[PDB]
Paper text:
In this study, we have identified the protein PE-H, a novel polyester hydrolase from the marine bacterium P. aestusnigri which hydrolyses different polyethylene terephthalate substrates with mono(2-hydroxyethyl) terephthalate (MHET) as the major hydrolysis product. The PE-H protein shows a canonical α/β-fold consisting of a central twisted β-sheet composed of 9 β-strands flanked by 7 α-helices on both sides, as already reported for homologous structures, i.e., cutinases and PETases. The highly conserved residues S171, D217 and H249 build the catalytic triad which is located closely below the surface with the S171 position known as the “nucleophilic elbow”. Two disulfide bonds are present in PE-H connecting C214-C251 and C285-C302 as is common for type II PET degrading enzymes.
The PE-H structure was solved at 1.09 Å resolution, containing one monomer in the asymmetric unit, with 10.7% for Rwork and 13.7% for Rfree. Although the electron density was of extremely good quality, the N-terminal part (aa 1–37) and one short stretch (aa 286–291) were not visible. The loop arrangement narrowing the active site cleft in the wild type enzyme is stabilized by a polar contact between the hydroxyl group of Y250 and the backbone amine of E102. In WT PE-H, residues of the loop connecting β3-α2 (F98, V99, S100) together with D129 and I219 are arranged in a way that access to the active site is limited, whereas PE-H variant Y250S shows a much deeper cleft. With regard to the active site cleft, Cut190 TM shows a similar narrowed active site as does WT PE-H, whereas PETase DM has a larger and deeper cleft as is the case for variant Y250S. In the apo crystal structure, the catalytic site of PE-H is apparently too narrow to allow favorable substrate binding. This suggests that in PE-H a conformational change is necessary to accommodate a substrate. Interestingly, wild type PE-H was not found to viably bind the tested substrates in the active site, but substrate molecules accumulated in an adjacent groove. Wild type PE-H was unable to hydrolyze a PET film substrate obtained from a commercial PET bottle (PETb).
Numbering used by the authors: 39 to 285, 292 to 306
Write the structure that this text describes.
Amino acid sequence: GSAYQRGPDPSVSFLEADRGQYSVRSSRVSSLVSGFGGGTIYYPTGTTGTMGAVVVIPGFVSAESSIDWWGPKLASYGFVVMTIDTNTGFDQPPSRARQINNALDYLVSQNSRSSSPVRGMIDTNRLGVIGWSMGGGGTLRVASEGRIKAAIPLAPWDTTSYYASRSQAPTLIFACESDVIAPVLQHASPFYNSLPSSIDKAFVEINGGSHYCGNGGSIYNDVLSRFGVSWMKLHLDEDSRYKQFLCDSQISDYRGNCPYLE
Ligand code: NA
């Protein structure tokens, strides 16, 4: 077992339920303070001890919807999860990496803020990022910098595999089969193929998915849940109970380097 582990021994049904074992509350973050634009912190209630913390970032101009599903969903298994608002002063992947870093810095600071609802809840050494589109390129950039312990690019877009090739964190890429914005063959697939051998990694292509398919809140929640929640459990919490879900008709392609070393 792991000192960080939370919640019951898992199952597929537990992962695919709308919520995990913890009740969740939320708290708004101002753009004036944050450095990253606004956001929303989701956190479990009725818990003690520190837990992993995750930034969830969007990144597509004129998006019709965003990544909000991940907030309450992931927090309810035992994480502090902050979604970033859609309309911000950030745009292409370089700026998204800065945005992510500013959001991580902000969350670290909350652990010691007397007046924060998440005071004392954050293990500042156990940080993850989930990021969509240009935010997915940003996620790969930040994964290469060596602070975060887990990365989940959603339908990532970028101009280079340079950062993917240098990822320092366990990386799970969700690809969207039918994506016309960041086509898999030009973005998610070559990014995955460039990832180092020295990290745990996975590639999950979601059958029929548009560019929005990794965002949650549509018809793909089962696959997102099984792989995404388990990714954070294994990699932020060192929780080997979740290896079983990582190592199917909704999946049109898969790659990985199981078995993952404990
Ligand atoms: Na297709």
